[PDB]
Amino acid sequence: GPMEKYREIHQRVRDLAPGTVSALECIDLLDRLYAVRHDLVDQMIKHDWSDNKDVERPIGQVLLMAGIPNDIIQGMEKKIIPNSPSGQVLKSFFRMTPDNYKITGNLIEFIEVTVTADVSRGIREAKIKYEGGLQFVEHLLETESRKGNIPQPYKITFSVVAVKTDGSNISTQWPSRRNDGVIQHMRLVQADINYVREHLI
Ligand SMILES: [Mn+3]
Ligand SMILES: [Mn+3]
């Protein structure tokens, strides 16, 4: 899988200069590993759960797909998210791309996979990004519900699935028979990651 991507990588590392001349960007390498590091855990979700088995899909299209009339959806396209640091316009916030989602009837759920060493931060980092404007939309539905322009009010759900770089909590974050597959695939890349990190400091 995304291991085939890690494949094409671990090449470029184990042959390396000391970090003095080195690879000026171990970063491009580094970043690459992270993407892969994220994708392993994403993949697992994309099997056991998600509606998008393909790719992460924009929030606009999620909405239509949950059967919310475009004319209503373009309704909120010009508004602005409450308590936003950036003052985000829902227009933009519909181009946003969370990793995984699932519709069931009048309910919509997102799941964001992240992985760092700092759990709450990643959780914090992402909540800050989505949960603000997701409640919004949900609310701007009931608001549109109590006027009866929809049959049913929609419930919406954003959870972050975030896993220690080691994997220890994947027990608690995402129990799956794919688990033990994932933890081990992580360990491998991690060693690469750390290595590139220990070649600087
Ligand atoms: Mn993503
Ligand atoms: Mn993510």
Ligand nearest, relative to CA of residue 112: 2
**Helix, strand, coil % over all residues of the chain, rounded to 5:** 50, 10, 40
Same domain, 166 and 198: no
Query: Ligand 1 centre from 133 Cα, in Å?
Result: 16
What tokens appear for 44 in the block?
A: 């697992």
H/E stretch holding 104 reads: strand 100-104
Ligand nearest, relative to CA of residue 123: 2
Q: Sheet holding 155-162: strands in order across? A: 100-104, 107-114, 155-162
Ligand nearest, relative to CA of residue 56: 1
Q: Is the CB of residue 105 less than 8 Å from the CB of residue 153?
A: no
Query: Ligand 1 centre from 18 Cα, in Å?
Result: 33
CA-wise closest residue to 200 among 18, 43, 36 = 18
Same domain, 143 and 87: yes
Same domain, 194 and 146: no
What's the domain count of the chain?
Answer: 2
Same domain, 166 and 72: yes
Same domain, 12 and 54: no
Same domain, 142 and 78: yes
Range of the domain at 83: 50-174
Q: Is the CB of residue 73 less than 8 Å from the CB of residue 46?
A: no
Helices (H), 69-178: 70-73, 90-93, 119-129, 131-145, 170-173
φ and ψ of 192, to 5 deg: -65, -55
Same domain, 63 and 154: yes
Measured at the CA of 137, the angle between CA 136 and CA 140, to 5 degrees, comes to 85
CA dist 28 to 9, 34, 38, 42, 190, Å? 10, 10, 15, 21, 16
Same domain, 144 and 188: no
Q: What resolution, expressed in A, was reported for this entry?
A: 3.0
Same domain, 15 and 84: no
CA distance 179 to 113: 14
Same domain, 187 and 145: no
